[PDB]
Amino acid sequence: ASLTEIEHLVQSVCKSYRETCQLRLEDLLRQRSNIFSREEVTGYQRKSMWEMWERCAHHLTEAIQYVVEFAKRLSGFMELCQNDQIVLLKAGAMEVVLVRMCRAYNADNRTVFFEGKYGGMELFRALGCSELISSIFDFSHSLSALHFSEDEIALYTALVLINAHRPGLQEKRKVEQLQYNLELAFHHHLCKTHRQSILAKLPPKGKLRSLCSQHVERLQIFQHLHPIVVQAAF
Ligand SMILES: CC(C)CN(Cc1ccc(-c2ccc(S(C)(=O)=O)cc2)s1)S(=O)(=O)Cc1ccccc1
Numbered sequence: 001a002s003l004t005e006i007e008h009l010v011q012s013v014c015k016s017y018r019e020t021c022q023l024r025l026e027d028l029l030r031q032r033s034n035i036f037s038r039e040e041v042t043g044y045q046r047k048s049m050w051e052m053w054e055r056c057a058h059h060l061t062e063a064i065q066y067v068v069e070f071a072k073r074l075s076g077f078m079e080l081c082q083n084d085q086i087v088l089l090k091a092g093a094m095e096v097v098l099v100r101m102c103r104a105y106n107a108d109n110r111t112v113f114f115e116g117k118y119g120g121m122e123l124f125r126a127l128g129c130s131e132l133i134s135s136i137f138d139f140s141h142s143l144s145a146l147h148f149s150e151d152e153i154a155l156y157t158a159l160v161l162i163n164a165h166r167p168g169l170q171e172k173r174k175v176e177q178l179q180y181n182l183e184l185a186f187h188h189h190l191c192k193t194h195r196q197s198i199l200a201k202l203p204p205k206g207k208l209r210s211l212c213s214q215h216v217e218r219l220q221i222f223q224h225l226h227p228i229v230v231q232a233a234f
Pocket of ligand 1: 021022023053056057059060063100101103104112113114124127132133136137215218219222
């Protein structure tokens with residue numbers, strides 16, 4: 001592929017992200033001052049783990065819907081066989097959601113945007129998993145420190161998804177070609193934006209893996225005893 005086509009892949013990936021980014025960065029940054037009062041935080045802390053779980057399950061499911069929509073708009077993704085589409089999303093969707101979360105994270109006061117306002121990790125106390133929440137907040141903090149742009153998120157999450165080493169792929173060569181093309185796109189766009197410096201500062205692939213694995217473990221435990229059928233975005 002020529003640099004002209006690489007640049008078109010760049011523009012295409014970034015447009016697909018902007019159409020499926022769920023919350024506008026502009027809104028997130030604007031609402032940073034709308035913070036939960038102490039009474040509001042206490043209101044959340046009094047809820048059952050089962051109520052917080054269902055709210056969290058609703059937000060995660062919805063975030064995942066937007067990630068699936070992003071993938072479907074990704075050049076070449078819909079050209080993969082159905083098995084492979086499923087393999088990639090099953091392995092990668094929740095890792096993308098975790099990356100996407102850094103946009104809603106405010107490093108200045110360590111709060112995150114949740115149901116209309118910004119709250120610290122103590123908001124989630126009823127869930128009884130401080131370590132995981134803390135790990136999620138630290139991970140977001142590490143990404144926010146980089147000032148990850150909207151397009152870097154777009155290109156980086158595309159590569160989280162389009163990973164040819166996911167076990168179970170039936171057309172591994174096709175995923176490899178897609179992955180390589182997206183790598184070209186990412187690297188070229190970092191050059192064009194003078195942002196080469198972020199590559200070495202990005203979280204190791206393994207860290208996103210171990211975090212999502214710990215995350216998924218909680219989800220399974222909650223969703224087993226309390227499934228919730230909730231509306232589809234697209
Ligand atoms: C804020 C996190 C640490 C806690 N969870 C609630 C959220 C779920 C989805 C969120 C979200 C959705 C969209 C964006 S966006 C539109 O800016 O991309 C950003 C964040 S916050 S949790 O559910 O991940 C914590 C949890 C709950 C239950 C079991 C395990 C973990």
